[PDB]
Structure 1
């Protein structure tokens, strides 16, 4: 999908997030561990408590990965290939979880950034995170 309109909107919205993307990524993860405790079984050795450095940094990683993705959004699978194989094959992460974290990440951006969350962006942002969580899942087996 992802028309020009969508792409533009997602870029413009993800820019205005900027350096706060990392802390949101962690806040997003925290919500996820609170909402769906089963995903904790994917992070055995991590400290999962509030604002844990391990959570906070992994969140900074998912944030920068995402910013990278939006920097060149017209080819996602080359950019994310190594993460494709990392989550897909080695870690074998069950595809429901990407849609979980996707939605928690939408709640998080909504809560912290009320003014930019007009419907058009909520739309193309959900499409965008769809397209990514797909590109990560399609090497599942």
Structure 2
């Protein structure tokens, strides 16, 4: 259950993320693929090399989904329902992979926005990403 304070923190953090969301998401996906190669098994049709256009497009998609989730933080199961069906019913992704991707997103945010990455913002983003991972994993 997200606190009201952490909600404002994640809203401000992703607002300052702004227009670099696609590049940040592509870099987070690249970090996840490099440091957790078992996550690559969910993309057997992809080209998972460095600078891949497919990875860049998927990072853009993930970033837009995260932006929508931020904009609809109080009604996430409704806003993210098509993604929940995709990841839970069809893809059937292990939640450990969601944890790994959330960590890689946090690492990318830390590396790109040092000033914005205060401990409170870090905790808020961690809780927000955990909430997002819960909705996509759950089948309802």
**Deviation of 1:94 (Å):** 1.1
Distance in 1 between residues matched to 2:89 and 2:4, nearest whole Å? 32
Greater than 3 Å deviation, 4+ residue runs: none
Distance in 2 between residues matched to 1:67 and 1:87, nearest whole Å? 18
**Deviation of 1:125 (Å):** 0.5
Q: TM-score, normalised by structure 2?
A: 0.97
Unaligned residue ranges in structure 2 (runs of 5+): none
Q: TM-score, normalised by structure 1?
A: 0.97
String of CA shifts for 1:54-96, please: whole Å, max 9, x gaps. 0000000000011011112100011100000001111111111
Distance in 2 between residues matched to 1:75 and 1:111, nearest whole Å? 30
String of CA shifts for 1:36-64, please: whole Å, max 9, x gaps. 10111110010000110000000000000
Distance in 1 between residues matched to 2:9 and 2:94, nearest whole Å? 29
Distance in 2 between residues matched to 1:3 and 1:32, nearest whole Å? 28
Unaligned residue ranges in structure 1 (runs of 5+): none
- SS class of match (1:16): helix
